[PDB]
Every structure is written in C-alpha cells, then in structure tokens.
Amino acid sequence: ELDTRETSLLVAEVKGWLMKLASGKGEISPSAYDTAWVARIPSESDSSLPEFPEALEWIINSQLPDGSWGDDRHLQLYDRVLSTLSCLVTLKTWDIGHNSIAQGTKFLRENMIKLKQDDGDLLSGFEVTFPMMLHEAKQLGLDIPYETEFTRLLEISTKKKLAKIPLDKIHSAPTTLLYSLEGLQDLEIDWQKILKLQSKDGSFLSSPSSTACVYLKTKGRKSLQYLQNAMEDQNYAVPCHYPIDLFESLWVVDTIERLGIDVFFRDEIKAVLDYVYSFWTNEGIGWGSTCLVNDIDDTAMAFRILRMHGYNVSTDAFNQFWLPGDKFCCFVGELSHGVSEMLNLHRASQVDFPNEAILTKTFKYSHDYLLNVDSAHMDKWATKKNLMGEVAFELANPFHDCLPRIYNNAYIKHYGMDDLWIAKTIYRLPLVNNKVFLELANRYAQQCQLYQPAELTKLVNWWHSSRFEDIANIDMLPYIYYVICATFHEQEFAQLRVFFSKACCLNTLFDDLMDCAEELDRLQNVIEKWDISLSHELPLEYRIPFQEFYNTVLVMTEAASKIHKNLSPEFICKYLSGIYTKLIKSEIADARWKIEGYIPSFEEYMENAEVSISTWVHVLMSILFCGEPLTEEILNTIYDSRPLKLDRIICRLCNDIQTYKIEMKLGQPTQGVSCYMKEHPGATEEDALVYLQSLLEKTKRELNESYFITHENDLPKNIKRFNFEMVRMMLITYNETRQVDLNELKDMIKFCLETYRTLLEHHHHHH
C-alpha cells in the first residue's frame, strides 16, 4: 500500500491534476543547470543588476547537502557535475553565494576525478554542454579540477565532431543542436541567422538555457520574453524544456489508460483530449503548443488516443516522417531515433482504418525495429522501471488479440512510480510518475477480483446441478470466466459475465458432442421445436445440454424482462430460443458436411460457417445485460448490422487460419482453406492462407472504423463495445503465443476445482 487516503480523496486529486493539464498547466521538476543559465541575464534597465534575482535565490536555497546541484533522489555524476558547474558559474558571475560556491567547488574537487565513460545516460548535448561549462568555470578562476583523462578525451572527441559539422547547415534547417546552442558559444555561428530558427514563442527547441545564450548573443526581444514568462510561470526555477503541454498531457492520460484507472476519470480525460485536439493538425504535433517541429512520438501518441476516443484524425500526419525504404524518423533530418517512439508508433499503427496504407508501413517498420533492440542493454540505467518489459509485451500482444485487464495487469507491474527522464539534465514528471496512480491501479485491480469468488461459486454450482458430469471437463469454465472478466470488468456487468459464461459453456458442450456424433436429425427434430416436452426422445448425452439450454433461456428471459420493461417476456424468449436454435442447427450443418463428402464453395461454406462460428450469438444474448436500452427494432436488425457481419467474418477467418494445420495433420477437408483451393486452381495452401490472412486484416480495419467512430444511427455504445470485445476474446483464444503462457487463470482453475470437490463430496471430507 502506497497511499493512505480514501479512494475518493485520490480520485479528487487526480481530477484536479487533469483539469490543470486541460488548461495547459502541468508539473516538471526545475533544472538547476537551466535556472542558473537563464539567471546569467542582466536587467535591461540596469545591466549591473540581474533580471532574475529570485532565480539566484532559488539556486542558493536548492543546493544539495553535499554541495552539488542536480537530481536529489538519483545521483548521476553527469547530472550533478554539469548542474553544479552551471550553478557555480552563475553565482560567481554575480559575486554572490560565497558559501554555496565553497560547497560547490569542494563537491567538484572530490568528484570530478570520478567521471568516466558508460556511467549513466548521455545527457542531451552533454558532449558540447559540459566542455563549454567547464571552460567557463576556468575563465572565472573557480577552484576545481580542470583536466582528467575523461575530460580531455571528451574535449578531444567533441572538437573533432564539431570540426566536421559544416556550420551553415546549423543556420539552414532545424537540427538538434538548436537545443544546446550554449555549448556552441565560441563557434563561428551567425547568431543573427540562427534567430530565424526560433519557435513561435521565441525559444530554441524550447530550451531555456539555449534560448538564453541566443538572447545574450543577439538581444532578440521574443527570446527574452519567452524566458521572462517561463520564469514567472515556473516560479523562477525553469525546467530544461518548456512548455511540454502536449507531451505531458498525452503521457498522463496514456499512463491512466494503460493502468486501467481511466474508469474514474472519463470527463476529465475528455477535457484534456479536447485541449490536445485544439492543437492537432494534418501534420501531427510536437511536444508543446509552441514547438518548432512535429515529431513522431507525440504524433503517434495523439493520433492513437484521439482516434480511440472518436476524434477525426488523419494518417496524413505520418507522411512527413517517411524515408525511402518504408522507414521512419522521429524528426525530419534526424540521424537516429529511440525505442519509446517506435513503441508508440507500433501501438498507433494498429488502430488503422481501411485504405490507410501508411500505417501498414509504420507497423512493419516499427515492428522490425522493436524485434531488433538490444534487450540486455536497453535502458540499462533503469530510468524506467521496465522499458524492455513494455517492448516485449507490445511485440507479443497484437491490439486485437489482447483484452483490457490483461494489458492493465501487465502494465501495473511495469509502471514506475518514481521513474526519471533524461534531457539536458535529469528531470521528473510527477504527474506521469507518482504513487497515487499506482495505488489507484492496485485498488481497482483488487475491486475486479472481489466479485469473482461468488460469481465463480455460482458457475460451479450451476455446472453441478445441471449434471454435465453425467455424459465432460469443467476446466472450460474458469477460462471462459477469465476472458469475460478481462473485457467487462466493472462490477455492474455481473449478469453479463455469468450469462455469457453459461452460454459459452452450453455451446462448447453441444458443439463438442456433435463434432463426434447420424441422428443429428433426431436432434435437429427436437431442437427445431425447442419443446422441453420432447426432451425425452433425446439420447441422454443430448438430453442433458438440451434441458439446461432450455432452462437457462427461461432464466435469461426472466432476468432480461426485469431489466427491459418495454420488452415482453415472450418477445425476449422467442428471441433467445430463436438465436440458439439457429446456431445449433447451423452447427449440425457444419457437422453433416464434415461426415459426408462435401467441400462446398467459399461463398456457400462461409455462409453457414459464419453463423456456425457461435460468436454472434453471445453478442445477441449479452446485449440484454449490457446496460443499454433496447427496442424490438434493435433486436430484429442487430444480426444484420455491419459490426455483426464483421464479427462473424473475422472470427471465421481467424478460426480457419489458426487451426488449418491442426486440421490437415489429420486430414480434414471442409474448411475455408480447402474451399478456397477448390475455387482457385494453382493456389497452393500457402496462397489460400495468405489470402485469408489478408482478408482478415482488411476486415479488422473495417471493424476499427465501425467501432472507434460514432456514426449516424449507430448501435448503442456498450453494444458496439461487446461486439468489439467478442471478436477479441475469440482472437486471443487463437493467439498461441499467449495461450501457452496462460497467473490469475491458474488460481481461477484451482478455486473452481476446490469448489467442485466440496460439491461432489456434499461437504463430507475424505483423506
């Protein structure tokens, strides 16, 4: 337990943070290096006085107890040495803070000799920023070491890299050197020309210190004003980049959604996404509302989250980052990029709509990159708690093959409540990384488990009293409960979770029985009539599931009639028996085609195989309990709606692709791969599967579009949601990477088996 307060207190606090973010106000730790840089500036009124005296007081009051400045909780020598240097140079320049200078130089005298290679993350621009700062300290005659094997090797290397940069490319187009111009002060820079590469707020890649250098080289008005306002907005201790209102708000929401605590924050999240959307363009976005360029990380992040929330955003935003070879950059003209942006690119590419081929290219490229990372070495200094864990999860879990609580429970183990971030120096994003998010995540995760014992206990009791043991393994039940718990986790969906579980069990039994039967006609006879009276003519193995199927329908009909007062019990019960008879007989059909010698068309086989796929019946039943109002027109048209068509197609294709070898290791002809082959001579099975795999991927894009966008005359929200999750519960069942892994599910299996034993012993205990 990480926080003591009531949930209501935590939730109110985060709501405050989110509404501040929805007005562009966030929280980034100050940068001692940047605060000291900007405080070099003298007032224009009186050049003998500082423009930012409060920043000089902050420097003096923020020195750490060992004489250094920098990140308090994670000591990194690069961060401490660079930050302390800057602070010393500025206190000395203004001839103040004699004691602080004394502590600072002493710290540097004990630790400069400790600087080495591969001792932490290269801070951004470190190669120029540290030698420059060191040289400025010497010009001031500070009493610190001025040469080590490390510092002279660094200066030699940097001088060679700088001597190879043609300087006019720095003034010609945006480069990452704009972030660290203070590291270039002594270079041959046409500072006047550099002014044309400022951001719309007068900053240079949003770096206060780099902006500060330009202002002292040029006295440009907009750059002073950017600093004056950043100083006043941040209370006179500025971060190393400002503002990052787009980056910070999207990462905070993303964190909230990946932890699965967005259930508490729906309105506030929408407010933040409206703020972000007011800055969305057809060329994406950068980290902030005044930044110079767009980047692929922010653009992928915003595209994915906005689209998932029903906003209209275009994949044209990704064209600017295309490179020959169907590769991508993070900023145009970059020389390399990192893993966070490919992770987010990879995630974004899977919410593609039809005819958005650029996202197939960004998917292939990011997937390929992510497959090739050096995992032994990725984030080896653990700025994040488990970045390589997030990569591995993302590679292994396709968006449509993953369920919400499965993703959330995995991220909860990855989430670092005290992660740090690397830029000019080390910084913190306490709104992204904090113990409050993780405590709320753990509490909601425990809420999702609370109802499971009782729900599982009723399911096992229903299994026993239905006499399924008298024909039949019960292991099927914890698994079915597991996936519906992961998709409809909110406690209010209990009737949905229980009825869905019963329905899936009943059909799994019937389908299994029929796939090993011919007097299916003796059965279709009874089922056609749906008459519990003619149950007695069934051969017992069909009698047990039939009578429980008939009973569960009545039970479902009573619960639904209590819920839906406008629907008559008779309408509901004709509907439920109708859908289950249609499914069952279609399952007899798929059976008698598998016994006789019939490989049909592809159109004909899949006309019956799409109804046979059983998936739509759980949609049609479950919507009775999904919390949405219903009408007869809805229940009469739902089977033919576009999202239900797509459901049936995707699940049939998936089944026929993923089981194909499991089918011919064993010689079975009636399947989509064969039926395709009987219609395209010269297609190998390799080409049939390729075609079916392509049709599957195309249908998934149609399902994305039908789902994330709210159309005119669209199905109610929770209904579209169930249909969406029904496809996913199907697909993950065939994601064989995940299946052999699968934890919670073993506990569910054990709980069910213990509950069964007690039932079978009639609670008499045996040794």
Residues that bind ligand GRG (CB under 6 A): 122-124, 179, 206, 241, 244, 247, 287, 295, 297, 330, 338, 340-341, 422-423
761 marked as binding residue: no
- Which residue number, 121 or 744, has a Cβ lying nearer to ligand GRG? 121
- Which residue number, 244 or 410, has a Cβ lying nearer to ligand GRG? 244
CB of 431 to ligand GRG, least distance (A): 14
CB of 243 to ligand GRG, least distance (A): 9
Q: Angle, nearest 10°, between helix axes 642-658 and 685-708?
A: 150
CB of 330 to ligand GRG, least distance (A): 6
Enclosing H/E stretch for 427: strand 426-427
User: Closest Cα partner for 305 from 335, 327, 280, 282?
Assistant: 280
CB of 78 to ligand GRG, least distance (A): 10
- Which residue number, 133 or 623, has a Cβ lying nearer to ligand GRG? 133
CB of 442 to ligand GRG, least distance (A): 25
Amino acid at site 505: C
Instruction: Determine the Cα–Cα distance for residues 267 and 496; give it in Å rounded to an integer.
Output: 25
CB of 332 to ligand GRG, least distance (A): 12
418 marked as binding residue: no
Instruction: Determine the Cα–Cα distance for residues 487 and 307; give it in Å rounded to an integer.
Output: 20
| Helical residues (DSSP H) of 530-614, grouped into ranges | 543-563, 569-595, 602-612
> Residue 263 corresponds to which tokens in the numbers above?
């259930």
CB of 287 to ligand GRG, least distance (A): 4
Beta carbons within 8 Å of 536's beta carbon, 6+ residues apart: 543
> Residue 340 corresponds to which tokens in the numbers above?
């966070």
- Which residue number, 247 or 303, has a Cβ lying nearer to ligand GRG? 247
515 marked as binding residue: yes
- Which residue number, 338 or 453, has a Cβ lying nearer to ligand GRG? 338
Relative to beta strand 327-328, strand 426-427 is: unpaired
Instruction: Determine the Cα–Cα distance for residues 268 and 286; give it in Å rounded to an integer.
Output: 22
- Which residue number, 257 or 297, has a Cβ lying nearer to ligand GRG? 297
- Which residue number, 179 or 575, has a Cβ lying nearer to ligand GRG? 179
- Which residue number, 303 or 462, has a Cβ lying nearer to ligand GRG? 303
Question: What is the CB-side half-sphere exposure of residue 488 using CA atoms within 13 A?
Answer: 29
161 marked as binding residue: yes
- Which residue number, 81 or 498, has a Cβ lying nearer to ligand GRG? 81
b/e code 703-731 from CB counts within 10 Å (16+ = b): bbbbbbeeeeeebeebbbbbbbbbbbbbb
CB of 188 to ligand GRG, least distance (A): 23
b/e code 515-524 from CB counts within 10 Å (16+ = b): eebeebeebb
- From residue 455, give the alpha-carbon distance in Å to each of 442, 508, 556, 718: 21, 20, 16, 21
Instruction: Determine the Cα–Cα distance for residues 116 and 113; give it in Å rounded to an integer.
Output: 8
**CA 132 to chain CA centroid, nearest Å:** 40
CB of 123 to ligand GRG, least distance (A): 6
The answer to whether the peptide bond before residue 539 is cis (omega within 30 degrees of 0) is no
> Residue 595 corresponds to which tokens in the numbers above?
């016994």
CB of 423 to ligand GRG, least distance (A): 4
- Which residue number, 122 or 709, has a Cβ lying nearer to ligand GRG? 122
Instruction: Determine the Cα–Cα distance for residues 649 and 644; give it in Å rounded to an integer.
Output: 9
Amino acid at site 82: L
CB of 339 to ligand GRG, least distance (A): 8
Enclosing H/E stretch for 327: strand 327-328
User: Is residue 47 a contact partner of residue 216, using CB atoms and an 8 Å limit?
Assistant: no
CB of 75 to ligand GRG, least distance (A): 18
| Residue 181 per-residue DSSP state | G
**CA 279 to chain CA centroid, nearest Å:** 21
608 marked as binding residue: no
- Which residue number, 242 or 275, has a Cβ lying nearer to ligand GRG? 242
Enclosing H/E stretch for 24: none
Instruction: Determine the Cα–Cα distance for residues 240 and 372; give it in Å rounded to an integer.
Output: 31
User: Is residue 492 a contact partner of residue 450, using CB atoms and an 8 Å limit?
Assistant: no
CB of 253 to ligand GRG, least distance (A): 15
380 marked as binding residue: yes
CA torsion, ordered 148, 152, 158, 159, to nearest 10 deg: 160
- Which residue number, 38 or 422, has a Cβ lying nearer to ligand GRG? 422
User: Closest Cα partner for 210 from 233, 232, 226, 229?
Assistant: 226
679 marked as binding residue: no
- Which residue number, 229 or 383, has a Cβ lying nearer to ligand GRG? 383
CB of 180 to ligand GRG, least distance (A): 9
DSSP β-bridge partners for residue 118: none
> Residue 378 corresponds to which tokens in the numbers above?
């990725």
Enclosing H/E stretch for 421: strand 421-422
- Which residue number, 431 or 726, has a Cβ lying nearer to ligand GRG? 431
Burial label, 578 (beta-carbon count in 10 A; 0-12, 13-18, 19+): middle
Residue showing tokens 């059976």: 591
> Residue 3 corresponds to which tokens in the numbers above?
């926080």
Binding site feature residues for Mg(2+): 295, 297, 511, 515, 655, 659, 663
Where is the binding site for substrate, in residues? 161, 380
- Residue numbers belonging to the annotated binding site: 161, 295, 297, 380, 511, 515, 655, 659, 663
